[PDB]
Amino acid sequence: PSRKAKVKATLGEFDLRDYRNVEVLKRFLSETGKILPRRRTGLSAKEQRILAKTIKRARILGLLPFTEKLVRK
Amino acid sequence: KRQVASGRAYIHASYNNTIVTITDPDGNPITWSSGGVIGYKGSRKGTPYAAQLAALDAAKKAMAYGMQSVDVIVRGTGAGREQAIRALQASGLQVKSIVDDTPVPHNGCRPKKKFRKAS
Amino acid sequence: KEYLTNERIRAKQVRVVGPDGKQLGIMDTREALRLAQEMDLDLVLVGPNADPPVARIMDYSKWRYEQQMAEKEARKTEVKSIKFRVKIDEHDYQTKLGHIKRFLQEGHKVKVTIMFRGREVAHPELGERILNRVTEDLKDLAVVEMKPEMLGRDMNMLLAPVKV
Amino acid sequence: ARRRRAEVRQLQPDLVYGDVLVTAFINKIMRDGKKNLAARIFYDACKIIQEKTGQEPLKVFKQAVENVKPRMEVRSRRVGGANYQVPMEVSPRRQQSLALRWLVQAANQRPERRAAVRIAHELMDAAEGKGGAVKKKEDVERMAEANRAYAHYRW
RNA sequence: GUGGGAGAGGGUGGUGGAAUUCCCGGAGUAGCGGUGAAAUGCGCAGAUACCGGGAGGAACGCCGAUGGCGAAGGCAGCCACCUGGUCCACCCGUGACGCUGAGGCGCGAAAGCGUGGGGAGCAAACCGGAUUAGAUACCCGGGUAGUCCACGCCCUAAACGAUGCGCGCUAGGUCUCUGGGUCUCCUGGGGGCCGAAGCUAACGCGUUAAGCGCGCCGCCUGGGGAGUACGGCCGCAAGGCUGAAACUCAAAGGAAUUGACGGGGGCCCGCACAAGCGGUGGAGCAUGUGGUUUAAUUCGAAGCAACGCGAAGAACCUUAC
RNA sequence: AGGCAAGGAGGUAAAAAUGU
RNA sequence: CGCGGGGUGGAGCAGCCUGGUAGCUCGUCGGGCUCAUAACCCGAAGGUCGUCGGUUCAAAUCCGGCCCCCGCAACCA
Numbered sequence: 001p002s003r004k005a006k007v008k009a010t011l012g013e014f015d016l017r018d019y020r021n022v023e024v025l026k027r028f029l030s031e032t033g034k035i036l037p038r039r040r041t042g043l044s045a046k047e048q049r050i051l052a053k054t055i056k057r058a059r060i061l062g063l064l065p066f067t068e069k070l071v072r073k
Numbered sequence: 074k075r076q077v078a079s080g081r082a083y084i085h086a087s088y089n090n091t092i093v094t095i096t097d098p099d100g101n102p103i104t105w106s107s108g109g110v111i112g113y114k115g116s117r118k119g120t121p122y123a124a125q126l127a128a129l130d131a132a133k134k135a136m137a138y139g140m141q142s143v144d145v146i147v148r149g150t151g152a153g154r155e156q157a158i159r160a161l162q163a164s165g166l167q168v169k170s171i172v173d174d175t176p177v178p179h180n181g182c183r184p185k186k187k188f189r190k191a192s
Numbered sequence: 193k194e195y196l197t198n199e200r201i202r203a204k205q206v207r208v209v210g211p212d213g214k215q216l217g218i219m220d221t222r223e224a225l226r227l228a229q230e231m232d233l234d235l236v237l238v239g240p241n242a243d244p245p246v247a248r249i250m251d252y253s254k255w256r257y258e259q260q261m262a263e264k265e266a267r268k269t270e271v272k273s274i275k276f277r278v279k280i281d282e283h284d285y286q287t288k289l290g291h292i293k294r295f296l297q298e299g300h301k302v303k304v305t306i307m308f309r310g311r312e313v314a315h316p317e318l319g320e321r322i323l324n325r326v327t328e329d330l331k332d333l334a335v336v337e338m339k340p341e342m343l344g345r346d347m348n349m350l351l352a353p354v355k356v
Numbered sequence: 357a358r359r360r361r362a363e364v365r366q367l368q369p370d371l372v373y374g375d376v377l378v379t380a381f382i383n384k385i386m387r388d389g390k391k392n393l394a395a396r397i398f399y400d401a402c403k404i405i406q407e408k409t410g411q412e413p414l415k416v417f418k419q420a421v422e423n424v425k426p427r428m429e430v431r432s433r434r435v436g437g438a439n440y441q442v443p444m445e446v447s448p449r450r451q452q453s454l455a456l457r458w459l460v461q462a463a464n465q466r467p468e469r470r471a472a473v474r475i476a477h478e479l480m481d482a483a484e485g486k487g488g489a490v491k492k493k494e495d496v497e498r499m500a501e502a503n504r505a506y507a508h509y510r511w
Numbered sequence: 512g513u514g515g516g517a518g519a520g521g522g523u524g525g526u527g528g529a530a531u532u533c534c535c536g537g538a539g540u541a542g543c544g545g546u547g548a549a550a551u552g553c554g555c556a557g558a559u560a561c562c563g564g565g566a567g568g569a570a571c572g573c574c575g576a577u578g579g580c581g582a583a584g585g586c587a588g589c590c591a592c593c594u595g596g597u598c599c600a601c602c603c604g605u606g607a608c609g610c611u612g613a614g615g616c617g618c619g620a621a622a623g624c625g626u627g628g629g630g631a632g633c634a635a636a637c638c639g640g641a642u643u644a645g646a647u648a649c650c651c652g653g654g655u656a657g658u659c660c661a662c663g664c665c666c667u668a669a670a671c672g673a674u675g676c677g678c679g680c681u682a683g684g685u686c687u688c689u690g691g692g693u694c695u696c697c698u699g700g701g702g703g704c705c706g707a708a709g710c711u712a713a714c715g716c717g718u719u720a721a722g723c724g725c726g727c728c729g730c731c732u733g734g735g736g737a738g739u740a741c742g743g744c745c746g747c748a749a750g751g752c753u754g755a756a757a758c759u760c761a762a763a764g765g766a767a768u769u770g771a772c773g774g775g776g777g778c779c780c781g782c783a784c785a786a787g788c789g790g791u792g793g794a795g796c797a798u799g800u801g802g803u804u805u806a807a808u809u810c811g812a813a814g815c816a817a818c819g820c821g822a823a824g825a826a827c828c829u830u831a832c
Numbered sequence: 833a834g835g836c837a838a839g840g841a842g843g844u845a846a847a848a849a850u851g852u
Numbered sequence: 853c854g855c856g857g858g859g860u861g862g863a864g865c866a867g868c869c870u871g872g873u874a875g876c877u878c879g880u881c882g883g884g885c886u887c888a889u890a891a892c893c894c895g896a897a898g899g900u901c902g903u904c905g906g907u908u909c910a911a912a913u914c915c916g917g918c919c920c921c922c923g924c925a926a927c928c929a
């Protein structure tokens with residue numbers, strides 16, 4: 001049931017609403033361009049939602065992937 | 074008559090037939106194999122063994138164009154995607170990587186009635 | 193149905209028949225085999241009962257395949273059997289008629305067959321009465337193939353399309 | 357047949373050579389429980405083998421068995437509404453048994469007069485890598501390959 | 512009122528990729544697709560599968576929830592605009608201004624219809640194939656309306672929490688989301704689950720009550736007849752509201768309980784099937800039976816559990832015909 | 833490397849009318 | 853009269869054309885399967901291929917004539 005690491009936990013203090021912040025953001029996506037859930041990221045419902053929105057915005061621009069590819073298989 | 078040594082292997086897989094297309098690293102396909110290519114009509118067309126056979130055939134064809142470098146790309150899921158991959162690994166090519174890639178709609182148009190009930 | 197090949201052939205002097213419309217005589221099994229090899233078409237015991245067994249020089253498997261294909265083709269275009277009674281109702285009759293009409297439209301031959309009990313005395317007349325009427329009704333689509341003939345425990349009427 | 361795996365029987369091995377396989381073969385040969393009938397037959401066959409193809413008759417038999425032992429067999433499962441001939445591995449004892457059965461069948465299927473003789477000939481054929489038993493084995497193998505697709509209905 | 516907050520609330524204008532199809536371009540060849548099997552279907556004018564672009568239309572993957580919003584129907588890419596509802600905190604302002612609501616007015620999924628557009632997929636009807644005794648069906652190949660938008664109309668629904676709204680009281684815990692705090696705990700507002708008292712026909716309900724009350728509205732008085740007739744209204748139509756009776760039945764029902772049953776599940780078993788040896792059915796005959804024939808073929812036994820059975824001894828006897 | 837489990841796959845659960 | 857196509861187990865139709873080697877469905881009867889009926893499954897029963905010939909070692913099959921059955925025309929008179 002996945003207990004490797006939490007994305008909020010490995011991290012320090014950061015802003016949610018900056019899409020222009022890709023390094024800290026490419027962390028909440030999957031290896032496939034896909035958003036990690038509550039039980040993989042570790043944020044508040046509200047916070048998670050905000051993050052998701054920001055991710056979407058970024059995608060719309062072109063900062064983060066819409067999707068990519070999983071490898072090795 | 075083209076000669077390349079280098080490229081990719083798409084395995085597109087429906088549960089009805091696991092198709093394998095070998096292409097150069099552009100995206101121009103030299104040779105391909107599927108179930109019916111290995112005779113196999115109908116039921117068995119998309120069984121794991123069939124898929125494996127197809128993969129082998131594809132590899133053989135590639136070899137007839139001096140081919141070694143092969144990047145795997147699996148599109149969808151059929152009766153034997155994993156088996157096909159295994160065959161490719163074994164077959165006789167320098168495999169790059171097994172790229173897992175579904176042509177999943179980002180909530181597209183309505184699916185068929187068989188693919189209805191998915192809801 | 194075994195037309196027998198090569199060394200499925202036990203009989204000594206087999207009548208070695210060619211592929212087409214020729215013969216090589218009544219020769220040994222080995223001889224026959226050799227002949228088959230020469231043509232590369234198998235030696236096939238097509239008439240074992242015959243005055244020494246008839247041994248055709250044909251590729252057996254291919255021939256069998258062809259036969260199978262033919263059989264499949266024959267499977268289909270076809271005949272619909274509409275089963276009436278003596279105790280059958282007016283609405284029911286109408287329904288049956290409609291079905292028959294549909295079949296005719298499609299392009300299917302029609303065995304309107306009546307299924308009887310005891311009283312094969314006041315069965316045949318009723319069978320006629322139903323079936324004749326039905327035929328009369330569907331005349332526009334249907335040329336009657338088989339008339340109402342009582343056949344022991346059943347009765348048949350059959351209809352063929354006038355045109356399709 | 358739903359509890360323990362149920363033991364294979366502990367054969368009293370051969371009196372002549374000192375082996376269980378031999379005994380099993382004898383038993384297979386014998387119908388109607390007339391053992392010393394068929395044991396004698398087997399011995400006659402062995403003698404024939406020794407004479408005709410000058411070799412140790414147990415060894416020959418073993419070789420024959422080895423030749424006819426099939427590692428892949430076909431079962432049958434109705435799956436979906438279509439009956440697929442299922443290609444699967446064989447357990448060793450079972451395989452051996454099958455081989456024995458086939459040998460016995462071949463011995464009966466042979467066109468000559470006396471059973472012992474027929475048996476001997478069959479065994480010789482098997483040793484060579486030919487005859488009837490071998491053919492049957494080959495057929496079975498083919499079946500477990502012309503159906504090698506449905507393999508995934510893994511029983 | 513002020514200070515904030517959460518949110519797929521609604522509308523208007525845009526955009527963002529995946530995907531689909533369709534077009535061109537390329538490489539490439541013998542099948543693809545489809546199924547429980549298959550066939551119709553497309554493909555040598557070269558399909559499918561693969562890459563490059565372009566054309567569209569529709570929908571919004573992941574997040575995404577057992578979650579949030581609305582009064583309900585409902586609502587999700589994202590952004591912008593306009594814009595509702597609401598929640599808290601201060602307790603600051605008003606001084607009972609409230610609660611309910613016959614009618615009325617408004618909204619009201621989906622389908623439907625009208626006018627005009629658009630049309631990729633899906634896809635009623637429809638045309639095929641199989642499947643089948645039959646196939647108007649389930650399954651596949653297309654396929655028209657329709658789905659989509661504008662404007663208009665329709666107004667029904669398992670329009671459900673099958674729970675009318677409003678406030679007051681009556682143990683807790685537990686998880687959730689959302690606000691403030693003196694922030695490992697308090698205190699509001701929502702969403703769930705377990706349960707005190709109590710209620711209930713039981714199931715269950717149980718501070719989001721079906722508890723205890725009060726307020727008002729809606730409706731109910733057996734089922735079928737029937738949401739039908741008849742009127743009346745509304746509607747372009749489909750139909751909708753509004754709503755009987757005559758007759759007919761001694762029931763229609765709910766909730767549980769015991770069983771039985773399930774082509775429901777889990778756990779088990781047996782020569783039950785598999786694994787194997789030998790048959791039965793095919794032959795003659797031995798027998799018993801059904802049927803038939805007879806003057807009588809005595810009578811019974813009936814799927815397993817009747818059929819070398821009563822009969823473990825029919826020439827007469829037995830024996831009953 | 834095994835150990836359990838969560839999720840995603842895909843394979844399987846065919847068909848089979850009635851009433852003394 | 854002229855021309856084309858076909859005549860086949862009881863009925864419908866394959867095979868002919870490409871000489872040897874006759875199939876399916878419906879119907880007949882019996883069995884099975886079922887607690888029982890249909891349905892089902894199986895069989896069993898059942899055709900010398902319209903017929904007379906010839907061909908050829910051998911004809912449903914190559915070929916003629918008759919017998920039919922279908923249809924199309926049948927004109928100048």
Ligand SMILES: [Mg+2]
């Ligand atoms: Mg405010």
Ligand SMILES: [Mg+2]
């Ligand atoms: Mg193209």
Ligand SMILES: [Mg+2]
């Ligand atoms: Mg004050």
Ligand SMILES: [Mg+2]
């Ligand atoms: Mg004052």
Ligand SMILES: [Mg+2]
Binds near residue numbers: 634
């Ligand atoms: Mg469609």
Ligand SMILES: [Mg+2]
Binds near residue numbers: 641
């Ligand atoms: Mg059909």
Ligand SMILES: [Mg+2]
């Ligand atoms: Mg239809």
Ligand SMILES: [Mg+2]
């Ligand atoms: Mg369809």
Ligand SMILES: [Mg+2]
């Ligand atoms: Mg319209």
Ligand SMILES: [Mg+2]
């Ligand atoms: Mg209601």
Ligand SMILES: [Mg+2]
Binds near residue numbers: 676
């Ligand atoms: Mg109200």
Ligand SMILES: [Mg+2]
Binds near residue numbers: 701
């Ligand atoms: Mg709410």
Ligand SMILES: [Mg+2]
């Ligand atoms: Mg609460």
Ligand SMILES: [Mg+2]
């Ligand atoms: Mg209590």
Ligand SMILES: [Mg+2]
Binds near residue numbers: 717
């Ligand atoms: Mg409760």
Ligand SMILES: [Mg+2]
Binds near residue numbers: 721
């Ligand atoms: Mg109550």
